[PDB]
């Protein structure tokens, strides 16, 4: 699908997409497309309207079709833009001009690999150490070549519930990761994610409630 779209930027952050909106002209109806960072397989739509950027999450439905939350299904993300370019339907305005990728610029692929496969890809990742107790997690973090932001994720007493251990000025910080009814992982009062690696890539880029940003993953035993 949308890997060859001129306005598909990729796994860029929400802020970076807004910077491109100011580079494009911020004319109301200017839009671009990027990869969603907290909804697996879904997309995100960044539209500028009234001197502000507006973001809409294009979720991938169960049948393989993409649709906005509380909306009608579209074959591909391009079709959704084409539909919303002629019909407003719940958005701020109609999509007028796309902001094609500037020259030199390619789709940004992040450490997501730098449905089934995604859900069980964390087992082999360096920051995931599996099921360990709290005392074991702090020991393993405290005894290596340590540096601020060194972290790991462990499985809590529940299978499906995880816990984040982060190093901050000699102290191992413990953050709880809980599952909701939908099945989305989130830190208390934090943004919800579909997978753990999306939680890592978000928190390794911005503090967002944490005392510091995740940096280097602790190597697993």
Numbering used by the authors: 9 to 122, 156 to 262
Task: Provide the publication's sentences verbatim.
The catalytic activity of Syk‐family tyrosine kinases is regulated by a tandem Src homology 2 module (tSH2 module). Syk and ZAP‐70 share a common domain architecture, which includes two SH2 domains connected by a helical linker, comprising the tSH2 module. Syk is recruited to these phosphorylated ITAMs through its tandem Src homology 2 module (tSH2 module) and is activated by ITAM binding.
18 Additionally, while some of the crystal packing interfaces are similar to those of the ITAM‐bound complex, not all of the interfaces are the same, suggesting that similarity in conformation is not due to crystal packing. Overall, the tSH2 modules in our ITAM‐free structure represent a set of conformations in which the SH2 domains have moved apart, with respect to the ITAM‐bound structure. The structure of the ITAM‐free Syk tSH2 module described here suggests that it favors the conformation corresponding to the ON state, unlike the tSH2 module of ZAP‐70, which prefers the conformation of the OFF state. Conversely, we find that the C‐SH2 of Syk is relatively rigid, even in the unbound state, and does not undergo a similar conformational rearrangement upon binding a peptide.
